[PDB]
Ligand binder design. Structure first.
Ligand code: HEM
Lengths: 499, 499, 499, 499
């Protein structure tokens, strides 16, 4: 016998006991008599528009594909839940953290980034780790990566970035000249660049990796007090990466490696877990931080801000229909229930917009009306109506303007966004030179040993080599700024690759 | 106080009862602490992106509109049932006729023909009478209208017709030349044109008008024997038209008069009803018939073809939410249960294609998933997946290829099309001159009496007059062919009309 | 020979006289043999899916309809130009007012608000007066209204407003209970509501109504020197409006009266024009202003803030294709070139989001490329790419990331937005009580004379009379808050109406 | 210096030199001041809605993606011309062949099949070969392949087939159980399934393979006589296939091998070319012939039906912008100028619908209006109007109904379709027994030599080595039904793989 994976269609007909098979039908529910031989005038004559069975199917077939994620197209998914094992109600008053043992059902999706839908899992790229919490207050999406930091700190340079990583407008090939001209001119990436070309670059599956909310957020307690926080949900399966070697063999032996490793893990019953933590920084402590507490290209050293365990993330159910439940999902950072709010983290401020923006496009206006995306542990109610493909509903014949004198939905002041005071002019404030080295240096010669320190200078040079020379220096320079040796090793290697 | 319609909100609230309102949430179900004031820095400062409340809402509002139906955009809808007051199971074996007494939930939408969503019901124009049956063998969309005949005999000239019947491409106004130039160049229109300007051109409210299927159809029984039939449903509310002045008045006082009439009649228990009948014709007779039995412009005389009583059509329910229940109601002439097949009606043949084609574009590739359209009385199982906005499970893990050896949906030798045998060179046979007078001449003389004739012409003469002298000639010319007098009688009015 | 609008097809045939007709082709360009009779196997047989002429033409016919603008569905559009005639450059460095005699192409559209596409023109309703300028610095849209004020003062209570106006979620009929229940609950509307029900609520055609910017905008000259402002452009054709009697008649007689009137004028050289002035309030003034200077329901009295002439708006070019030129026409208040900026007017701010947004839905992601919408007088060059229905050269090989060292477009540091200082807490400041009457009273008492006040209350009562009693009560109350006479004069009429 | 594909940007800057870079603007052409730092309230403050530079850019990015082709997603495309070399004026009256030395602009896209957009070029999968001839009679899309046969002879099966190749509905991974199950239960595949695993399964470069109109078509001369034919465009650069290990190496070393390879050729003057031939068969012969002369899994033998020469296919132009020219490219078999006509193929006929149809989905209603799809060597003129993103002018003010009396587009009898007399009942004729083994055996034996013969079994087994035995068996039952040793060798291999 094979693995639970391949034995899919197998484990399907079985459980289907001896119950006869459903009756093939058209979308209209008309029982199809013969769906193998099209209607034709004569055995060698043309086809009639009359074969609606055919028309009905081909028509549906011609419209399956929808736009793939603008980023993170390739990924895996599965559901499970979250459970409380610590009390942090002092910090946030969210319903998901209510009492201890408070298990909220979740939905998570792993994925790559730069590659398309046909791409393989096993390759150097950050990883998409987004959780969908279904809470009585509504849904809460923690759209996070496998790291607490990203490459850029101003949303505006993101589209340009994603481009710099994806194909060339003309050749449609991957273009290093682009990948590095951008990185080179934007040293802020330094930090997250180094993390990428580290060993973590390619985990073993989606399980032996770490999850983070990356950004800085804001918790609020039932007492109206607030404090900035950072979420870290480590892996209980342990950290594990794949040598550039395997990453390549796997790249072709099983392009969907990480994909079926997650399905079998849960099929065989070995459910992947993660222990959720959170750092904590008061506003007072925020004004003090030697750095921008809201800079996405920075971290809060654990020593100065220790981790507090909060919960256990347990994925235990495997998706049935992938399209409907995984590809069709929708993780929107904007979705945050009372007790949780965004920080003025310029990058975070960008996700507040983009996700619902695209979602409406990828899936359509009512993209939340999709089962997987619908917040069922809540009771959506308001003054919104219509839209294409309006399922449900449509919120019945209830009044549609606010305010109204007809007992239609009223607001709840208990969920008012926490009020903070901000002073200063309205201007395009430059964050470019917000120190893109320090924390980086203490990562090259403080977080990594000599072994991986080198594996880095090797990985990087192996790619940089392909970029125009003038580019290489503009890069070596920056790296150097993190530490001379850093740029020395790399540069060296390059020249050897440079013939 | 006033009418039930206008009392919509009232009642809704009284039913709502003492039940406290629902917490006003965002699309994501998150409660809103205050959906009346925006998040602005300062009481007179800028608006913030961070106001995902505003953006959430506003956004759905920006997508509230879907393209109105290409034709018959304005209308009203109601649900109810259908009863089997007779056993017509000798001709058609459709389960919707199974046994006397059986009932099948129906859905109907009345509509005008040309005017967009904002026009007025009380205007001369044919009328849409769609009857959707939710059977146990899929659905059945009998797209009827108040008239058994139409204007054209071949689809190809349909998109062209509707055009002439709408706004000039440059001015955007109703064009008399666009209208009459077309009607004059296509005599086959001579029939319905007459019926159109007659007293039936404006039926007083929906309840007071008949419904027809026009297209010759096919009824297959148990033995597989087949026949051609027509579908007529006479109104139990008796016929009632609206004088030009009484309608032309209601055009403003109440442009949605028809919509209100219906809702109101129902809301007051007074349900509109229709008896169903059909006309049966043998391939042999259809052979002998003096005309083309599938010529939409002609009718099967009562005498030669009496109407057999079928069952009843009760409208005892009003829509809850209009946009989700009526606006989206989609009727595809293709939905025919095993037992009702189309006919070689060149006109019908076209529709077979169009409805789903457009429904796939107005509502979406998965429109058959909309609650109203879904055949909730049968089990839809087939090999079609994905498509934007996939509701339900999408046949979960069930296979997707046919045939297959995994106990997936099967065939239905019983639901096989009937086998008719045609012959002749496959080409484009000009149907332009298949007697465009006979029946028109029988209408203008034996069906109408002098006062009814008088009207017809004045009605016609008053509209045709705005066309160019030349079209007027061409127009009158065709009328004389039906009958000398018809022509001159109208002509007369024109010369006067030309003051 | 009638009005130029009627003879549209005439002058066409005429226009291309000696020039022989072009060949009829499918979408693909292939020539069409016989476009009248579909390809049916046998003169009375089915329709071959092999017939492409049909399918091609039919499938397209099936997708002709796109959503109609969310609000202001029914309108009229013409193209003309703008000519500067006064140096106001000391207030805005906008390249549009650049210098005396300056000519900038414009495109305007007139509209109603609540009615859908079939809706009648001559009805009480504000009027849209959206201009589009194709300035050398990019398109500058100034979306004017036939009134310099609006009902609500916060963008959040807007979707609700429109809802109250349009059809009821259930019956689908206009609901006066809905309308007035709303206005009654938000007295800020008094001002505009009063204007609306005044003779000005039903202008005789588009040629007799002033256009306004309503919102306060911020102008910025060459020395980054700012100044708030109001946009006014009075008709040069004289203020004229249809009585309540002519309006109803026309309502059914000529639903497209505005269209017809506007088309004809131009068509016959009788070009309409508007002079554009602007009031100038300095930051120091907007400070001590007796009201919030960014409150859409208020106006800067001519007395303390004059009107400085700018130039003229002239329309002299009818649309050739309505759909392609007047329909797909989309204006974004967000489009403002260097020198013309927004104010903190909350009501305005929202608009910065919604117009481009909704457009991305109605017209489509790449709608900015639709001819009538492209800033043809400017040269786009950005890192934007792809999306459906992408024309032009998608900037071709051009680099796609920013910054880049490959000579792609750069940022002009001279068009950097002006910078203002705002301080305070950031939150939901409740601006529902910023005086909802003062100005209203001035309008009722000093702007209108008895003759007028008489029609107004009559008019208000005409509609309101139908709102449930408790609603009418609440309504008269407010009016009284403007003036005892106001509420009373109506009340009487009310009690009068109730038998 | 490196290859052309690598030096893409390098050249852009080079040639685009001696020119000040363009001004980076917005969608509306407004110059941006700084596109690197979003607008906020103070250095550490929230992002303002005011920032439109941001939104515009972001939203537009949030939509860059459109759905990929349901099949043949991964591909490379280029442009060239077709040159007549021989006179087959007698077989076709088609203008594209008018004379000797007649050039016609063509566009081409090569593509794998069951692989998603991100997949890798080199993999056992048929190659998509589609040429778009822009002729004076519009565009004639010759939607071919690198093989002259397919896996099934009935459209209906296609969706079911295609799904079998793609991913598993639940585990989303590629699944052999599905693969082989389909083929096992469907023997017609045999012929094409053999060719696949043959040495031709993985062609080296897109230039070292052939082209096969595949289907059977019809030809019509000026005198009206018709006949059937087979299209063949043999590679001039010669056939060069890739090994199995090599293929799987570039598979991850360079997954975009096709693109690069092909792009570089044309980039250096090494323009590839193909010779277009035609096999001819007269109706008479179409009668004598011995299995269905249209069976898509049957090829005419050069022996009895020889290869006639026609012309040259030369591709000497690379796309400037890929998304604009290749991604948006749309080839519709339904496009066919006079002289070329479909044939009964129960497979082809269906294609005539899937292509234009699925396009109205993937790209949009007016997709034929996208620059590369437009039939620019002709002149579209008809009665089709509107639809979203209506580019051009919608045809201006021309009359929109046919017929008309205003000199609008007329028709050409010259373009009438050939009339074939088809006799025989109208029903679903089984095609499962049309011989799916005779021709096949001839391959394995004749066309194939002992050497390659081995690499087939080895390959056909290397894959099937993952399908439940019960499946493996069924398969061997056919291969052997082809020829004893075929399944023999296979079965011998399979056993070892079964460890
Ligand atoms: C922030 C609140 C606003 C939002 C979200 C908003 C939204 C809309 C929407 C959805 C339409 C439909 C347009 C169409 O279908 O053609 C519209 C039309 C219009 N808006 Fe309002 N708008 C806002 C504020 C205003 C203000 C502040 C003005 C003052 C120019 C204005 C002027 C117009 C005009 C002129 C039209 C009609 C355009 C035409 O048909 O030519 N809007 N607006």
């Amino acid at each position: 016998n094979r693995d639970p994976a391949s034995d899919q269609m197998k484990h399907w007909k079985e459980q289907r006991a001896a119950q006869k098979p459903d009756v093939l039908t058209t979308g209209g529910g008309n029982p199809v008599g013969d769906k193998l031989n099209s209607l034709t005038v004569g055995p060698r004559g043309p086809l009639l528009v009359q074969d609606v069975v055919f028309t009905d199917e081909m028509a549906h077939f011609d419209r399956e594909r929808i736009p793939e994620r603008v980023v993170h197209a390739k990924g895996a998914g599965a559901f499970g839940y979250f459970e409380v094992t610590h009390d942090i109600t002092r910090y946030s008053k969210a319903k998901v953290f209510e009492h201890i043992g408070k298990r909220t059902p979740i939905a998570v999706r792993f994925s790559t980034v730069a590659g398309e839908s046909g791409s393989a899992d096993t390759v150097r790229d950050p990883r998409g780790f987004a959780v969908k919490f279904y809470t009585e207050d509504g849904n809460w999406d923690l759209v996070g990566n496998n790291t607490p930091i990203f490459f850029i700190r101003d949303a505006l340079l993101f589209p340009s970035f994603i481009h710099s990583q994806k194909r060339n407008p003309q050749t449609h090939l991957k273009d290093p000249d682009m990948v590095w001209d951008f990185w080179s001119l934007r040293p802020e990436s330094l930090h997250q660049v180094s993390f990428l070309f580290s060993d973590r670059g390619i985990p073993d599956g989606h399980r032996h990796m770490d999850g983070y909310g990356s950004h800085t957020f804001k918790l609020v307690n039932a007492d109206g007090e607030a404090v900035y926080c950072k979420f870290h949900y480590k892996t209980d399966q342990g950290i594990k990466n794949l040598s550039v070697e395997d990453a390549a063999r796997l790249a072709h032996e099983d392009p969907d490696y990480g994909l079926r490793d997650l399905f079998n893990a849960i099929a065989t019953g070995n459910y992947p877990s993660w222990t959720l933590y959170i750092q904590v920084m008061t506003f007072s402590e925020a004004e003090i931080f030697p750095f921008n507490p809201f800079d996405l290209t920075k971290v809060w050293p654990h020593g100065d801000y220790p981790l507090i365990p909060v919960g256990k993330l347990v994925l235990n159910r495997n998706p049935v229909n992938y399209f409907a439940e995984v590809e069709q999902l929708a993780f929107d950072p904007s979705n945050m229930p009372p007790g949780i709010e965004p920080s003025p983290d310029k990058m975070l401020q960008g996700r507040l917009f983009a996700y619902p923006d695209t979602h409406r496009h990828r899936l359509g206006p009512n993209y939340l009306q999709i089962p997987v995306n619908c917040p069922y542990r809540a009771r959506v109610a308001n003054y919104q109506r219509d839209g294409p493909m309006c399922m449900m509903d449509n919120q019945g014949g209830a009044p549609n303007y606010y305010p109204n004198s007809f007992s239609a939905p009223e607001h709840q002041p208990s969920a008012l966004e926490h009020r903070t005071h901000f002073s200063g002019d309205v201007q395009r404030f430059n964050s470019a030179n917000d120190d893109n080295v320090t924390q980086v240096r203490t990562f090259y010669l403080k977080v990594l040993n000599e072994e991986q320190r080198k594996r880095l200078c090797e990985n990087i040079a192996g790619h940089l080599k392909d970029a125009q020379l003038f580019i290489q220096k503009k890069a070596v320079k920056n790296f150097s700024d993190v530490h001379p040796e850093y740029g020395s090793r790399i540069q060296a290697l390059l020249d050897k690759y440079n013939e």
